[PDB]
Enzyme design. Structure first.
Site, PDB file in Angstrom:
ATOM      1  CG  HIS B  41      51.031  35.794 -19.818  1.00  0.00           C
ATOM      2  ND1 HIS B  41      51.209  36.274 -18.534  1.00  0.00           N
ATOM      3  CD2 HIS B  41      49.881  36.342 -20.244  1.00  0.00           C
ATOM      4  CE1 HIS B  41      50.202  37.068 -18.202  1.00  0.00           C
ATOM      5  NE2 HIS B  41      49.400  37.133 -19.237  1.00  0.00           N
ATOM      6  CG  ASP B  90      48.827  34.790 -23.097  1.00  0.00           C
ATOM      7  OD1 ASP B  90      49.222  33.813 -22.458  1.00  0.00           O
ATOM      8  OD2 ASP B  90      48.709  35.923 -22.628  1.00  0.00           O
ATOM      9  N   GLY B 190      47.790  41.187 -13.077  1.00  0.00           N
ATOM     10  CA  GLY B 190      47.195  40.367 -12.041  1.00  0.00           C
ATOM     11  C   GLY B 190      45.794  39.862 -12.418  1.00  0.00           C
ATOM     12  CB  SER B 192      47.209  37.825 -16.799  1.00  0.00           C
ATOM     13  OG  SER B 192      47.631  39.017 -17.462  1.00  0.00           O
ATOM     14  N   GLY B 193      44.737  35.754 -17.436  1.00  0.00           N
ATOM     15  CA  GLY B 193      44.179  34.421 -17.394  1.00  0.00           C
ATOM     16  C   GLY B 193      42.673  34.400 -17.150  1.00  0.00           C
TER      17      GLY B 193
HETATM   18  C1  LIG Z   1      51.785  38.313 -22.069  1.00  0.00           C
HETATM   19  C2  LIG Z   1      52.734  38.556 -21.204  1.00  0.00           C
HETATM   20  C3  LIG Z   1      52.620  39.110 -19.868  1.00  0.00           C
HETATM   21  C4  LIG Z   1      53.519  38.670 -18.899  1.00  0.00           C
HETATM   22  C5  LIG Z   1      53.478  39.176 -17.618  1.00  0.00           C
HETATM   23  C6  LIG Z   1      52.542  40.135 -17.251  1.00  0.00           C
HETATM   24  C7  LIG Z   1      52.581  40.571 -15.826  1.00  0.00           C
HETATM   25  C8  LIG Z   1      53.732  41.219 -15.380  1.00  0.00           C
HETATM   26  C9  LIG Z   1      53.866  41.640 -14.078  1.00  0.00           C
HETATM   27  C10 LIG Z   1      52.857  41.375 -13.158  1.00  0.00           C
HETATM   28  C11 LIG Z   1      53.023  41.882 -11.764  1.00  0.00           C
HETATM   29  O1  LIG Z   1      53.393  43.043 -11.611  1.00  0.00           O
HETATM   30  N1  LIG Z   1      52.770  40.984 -10.656  1.00  0.00           N
HETATM   31  C12 LIG Z   1      51.397  40.834 -10.100  1.00  0.00           C
HETATM   32  C13 LIG Z   1      50.764  39.441 -10.343  1.00  0.00           C
HETATM   33  C14 LIG Z   1      51.727  38.335 -10.802  1.00  0.00           C
HETATM   34  C15 LIG Z   1      49.991  38.957  -9.110  1.00  0.00           C
HETATM   35  C16 LIG Z   1      51.693  40.700 -13.585  1.00  0.00           C
HETATM   36  C17 LIG Z   1      51.553  40.301 -14.903  1.00  0.00           C
HETATM   37  C18 LIG Z   1      50.296  39.581 -15.319  1.00  0.00           C
HETATM   38  O2  LIG Z   1      50.426  38.378 -15.636  1.00  0.00           O
HETATM   39  O3  LIG Z   1      49.189  40.202 -15.389  1.00  0.00           O
HETATM   40  C19 LIG Z   1      51.590  40.547 -18.196  1.00  0.00           C
HETATM   41  C20 LIG Z   1      50.623  41.661 -17.945  1.00  0.00           C
HETATM   42  O4  LIG Z   1      51.005  42.695 -17.413  1.00  0.00           O
HETATM   43  N2  LIG Z   1      49.388  41.536 -18.474  1.00  0.00           N
HETATM   44  C21 LIG Z   1      48.452  42.581 -18.710  1.00  0.00           C
HETATM   45  C22 LIG Z   1      47.113  42.254 -18.911  1.00  0.00           C
HETATM   46  C23 LIG Z   1      46.200  43.238 -19.227  1.00  0.00           C
HETATM   47  C24 LIG Z   1      46.592  44.583 -19.335  1.00  0.00           C
HETATM   48  C25 LIG Z   1      45.607  45.613 -19.741  1.00  0.00           C
HETATM   49  N3  LIG Z   1      44.445  45.232 -20.206  1.00  0.00           N
HETATM   50  N4  LIG Z   1      45.911  46.890 -19.760  1.00  0.00           N
HETATM   51  C26 LIG Z   1      47.940  44.897 -19.155  1.00  0.00           C
HETATM   52  C27 LIG Z   1      48.849  43.911 -18.851  1.00  0.00           C
HETATM   53  C28 LIG Z   1      51.663  40.062 -19.501  1.00  0.00           C
END
Ligand SMILES: C=Cc1ccc(-c2ccc(C(=O)NCC(C)C)cc2C(=O)O)c(C(=O)Nc2ccc(C(=N)N)cc2)c1
Ligand SMILES: *[C@@H]1O[C@H](CO)[C@@H](O)[C@H](O)[C@H]1O
Ligand SMILES: *[C@@H]1O[C@@H](C)[C@@H](O)[C@@H](O)[C@@H]1O
Ligand SMILES: [Ca+2]
Ligand SMILES: [Ca+2]
Ligand SMILES: [Ca+2]
Ligand SMILES: [Ca+2]
Ligand SMILES: [Ca+2]
Ligand SMILES: [Ca+2]
Ligand SMILES: [Ca+2]
Ligand SMILES: [Ca+2]
Ligand SMILES: [Ca+2]
Lengths: 116, 254, 142, 75
Positions: B41, B90, B190, B192-193
């Site tokens: 993602h 994912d 942030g 993620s991955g």
């Molecule tokens: C699968 C889809 C998906 C898509 C986008 C995002 C996403 C959306 C916005 C931003 C953001 O605000 N920008 C900061 C970053 C880019 C440097 C970052 C992400 C991300 O990839 O983590 C997430 C996502 O939030 N994943 C996530 C992972 C773990 C938990 C938890 N363990 N609680 C909660 C949420 C999931």
């Protein structure tokens, strides 16, 4: 993932049933009688030796004695009772393991009854 | 990461940072000298498949020291079954242009066999998750690599124990729950991955990938991780496959 | 028991519920009060569940009320000590004692393996690195 | 496949036995046990029985709280 079911929680020290006590012996010293309760072995092993109930609970464990026209009771925080009795009367005895601090399963079942 | 600790420099040495044109994108996990595992993602909105760098040996994003190595990502491999804007499947496999050099500061996490992972790793309660993501749901990102211990749940217990909510995606067999929870709690946006790493008898294995959650710490909610064990054969087959010419590549799953 | 006589002789609990074996009334011919009779009767009438010798493999049987407890020799477990611990060396049991990978084989013993970058020691379960930086070790602590 | 039910602890002097229903029909059981913060340990592998002796685990520390679970597999 396989189908599974969860058990209730279990705390051995608080929930294992106490086993049936037995009386090892009784002896007379004039007007006084000594009643000895056998130390019942548990499945807790300290190095290839099964521990007794006393070794595991220590001071948490007491033994109660019923003897006998009603019933009299005596308590001990060891495995021995020293009771006063009347001369020339024959008495009968039974013992129960108790852990006063417990909320459930506080009492063992009564031992076999022994008589003079 | 919310409620975690700093990972002392060197002690999370398989953490990867991904940047796109200098901006922080996602975490990753080094599994050998040329291959990195991340989340699918993370790449949904890229369109500069050459502004895409991996950084290894990172610790403090605000100072460059001699332990950092950079590499260009040559290729991003995702499942054909993955669908942008969803949560299932994912996972991403990344080929580096040139190898990293292994050092006291840069070491791969072991990818395990499928059966070892399912039969043994799955039943180790606590695993570590790490990243430079948000310290709080609201809040800001970390400058120093953060790390956290999370307990694993079986899905049946995760459903029966998560607070119910109108439009949360299904937990699939390609996922597993964190975390507990209770709010203290978890991982976050942030991160993620990034890796969920399991210790067993002296060695560390990749068992998970930070994927999604309903926001952070997640109250009545758990973190959800890609269940790496499902993709092992697919990872191994692609790691021996011949480089295709494009950057982004959708490989069939299974 | 009670012969032509025997019974001529007054109530004993000796030579009447124990050198022989008594009915519930030969038991209150004796105790008179009944909490007292029930109390004796509970244990007396229960019988030795250990008589069937349920504990196997050298175990010792301790009698209870309507049940028993088997104490087992160390290499054994189960209600009746029926389970040989030594026959349970399969990969689903603590990974077979393998440090890394475990392989089950019908017909033969489980064999342990190691990840790329390690090889198996002589003891048959331990893995050791055959390279300088193997996967999943943290050099700055090793 | 049916989930086991009526999981019951039978304990007397630390002799500790998990029991459940039902009698299995083309399915076998495996049992797992842990402390609240420990790893899951597998016992009584692929049994056709409706009990499992867990004594040897629980006597390692009698003051811990343990949780158990019973897994159902098709034969
Ligand atoms: C699968 C889809 C998906 C898509 C986008 C995002 C996403 C959306 C916005 C931003 C953001 O605000 N920008 C900061 C970053 C880019 C440097 C970052 C992400 C991300 O990839 O983590 C997430 C996502 O939030 N994943 C996530 C992972 C773990 C938990 C938890 N363990 N609680 C909660 C949420 C999931
Ligand atoms: C021995 O006897 C017990 C009860 O006394 C019985 O439960 C067992 O099956 C038998 O072997
Ligand atoms: C009773 O306990 C078991 C464990 C063995 O030691 C037997 O020989 C003994 O009589
Ligand atoms: Ca830096
Ligand atoms: Ca007679
Ligand atoms: Ca008679
Ligand atoms: Ca006699
Ligand atoms: Ca006689
Ligand atoms: Ca009569
Ligand atoms: Ca008589
Ligand atoms: Ca008579
Ligand atoms: Ca009995």
């Amino acid at each position: 993932e396989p189908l599974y079911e969860n058990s209730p929680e279990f705390t051995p020290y608080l929930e294992t049933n106490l086993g049936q006590p037995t009386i090892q012996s009784f002896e007379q010293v004039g007007t006084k009688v000594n009643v000895t309760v056998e130390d019942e072995r548990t499945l807790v092993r300290r190095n290839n030796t099964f521990l007794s109930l006393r070794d595991v609970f220590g001071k948490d464990l007491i033994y109660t004695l019923y003897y006998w026209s009603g019933k009299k009771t005596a308590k001990t925080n060891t495995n021995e009772f020293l009771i006063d009795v009347d001369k020339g009367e024959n008495y009968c005895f039974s013992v129960q393991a108790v852990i006063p601090s417990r909320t459930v399963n506080r009492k063992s079942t009564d031992s076999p009854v022994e008589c003079m | 990461i919310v409620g975690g600790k700093v990972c002392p420099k060197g002690e999370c040495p398989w953490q990867v940072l991904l940047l796109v044109n200098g901006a922080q994108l996602c975490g990753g996990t080094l599994i050998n000298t040329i291959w990195v595992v991340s989340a699918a993602h993370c790449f949904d909105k890229i369109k500069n498949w050459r502004n895409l760098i991996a950084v290894l040996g990172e610790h403090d994003l605000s100072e460059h020291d001699g332990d950092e190595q950079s590499r260009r990502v040559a290729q991003v491999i995702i499942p054909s079954t993955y669908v942008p804007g969803t949560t299932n499947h994912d996972i991403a496999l990344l080929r580096l242009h040139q190898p990293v050099v292994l050092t006291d500061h840069v070491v791969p996490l072991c990818l395990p066999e499928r059966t070892f992972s399912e039969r043994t790793l799955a039943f180790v309660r606590f695993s570590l998750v790490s990243g430079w993501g948000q310290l709080l749901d609201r809040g800001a990102t970390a400058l120093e690599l953060m790390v956290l211990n999370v307990p694993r749940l079986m899905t049946q217990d995760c459903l029966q124990q998560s607070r119910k909510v109108g439009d949360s995606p299904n937990i699939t067999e390609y996922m597993f729950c964190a975390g507990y929870s209770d709010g203290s709690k978890d991982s976050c946006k942030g991160d993620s991955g990034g890796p969920h790493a399991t210790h067993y008898r002296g060695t560390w294995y990749l068992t998970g990938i930070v994927s999604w959650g309903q926001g952070c710490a997640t109250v009545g909610h758990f973190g959800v991780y890609t269940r790496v064990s499902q993709y092992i054969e697919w990872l191994q087959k692609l790691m021996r496959s011949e480089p295709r010419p494009g950057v982004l590549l959708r490989a069939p799953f299974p | 028991a009670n012969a032509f006589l025997e019974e001529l002789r007054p109530g004993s609990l000796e030579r009447e519920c124990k050198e022989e074996q008594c009915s519930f009334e030969e038991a209150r011919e004796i105790f008179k009060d009944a909490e007292r009779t029930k109390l004796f009767w509970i244990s007396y009438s229960d019988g030795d569940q250990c008589a069937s010798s349920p504990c196997q493999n050298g175990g010792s049987c301790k009698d209870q009320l309507q049940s028993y407890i088997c104490f087992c020799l160390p290499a054994f477990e189960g209600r009746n000590c029926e389970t040989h611990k030594d026959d349970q060396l399969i990969c689903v049991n603590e990974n077979g004692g393998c440090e890394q990978y475990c392989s089950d084989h019908t017909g033969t013993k489980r064999s342990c393996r190691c990840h790329e970058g390690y090889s198996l020691l002589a003891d048959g379960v331990s893995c050791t690195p055959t390279v300088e930086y193997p996967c999943g070790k943290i050099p700055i602590l090793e | 496949t049916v989930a086991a039910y009526n999981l019951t602890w039978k304990s007397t002097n630390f002799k500790t036995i998990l029991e459940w229903e039902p009698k299995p029909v083309n399915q076998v059981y495996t049992v797992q046990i842990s402390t609240k913060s420990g790893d899951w340990k597998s016992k009584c592998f692929y049994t056709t029985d409706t009990e499992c002796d867990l004594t040897d685990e629980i006597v390692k520390d009698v003051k811990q709280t343990y949780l158990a679970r019973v897994f159902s597999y098709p034969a």
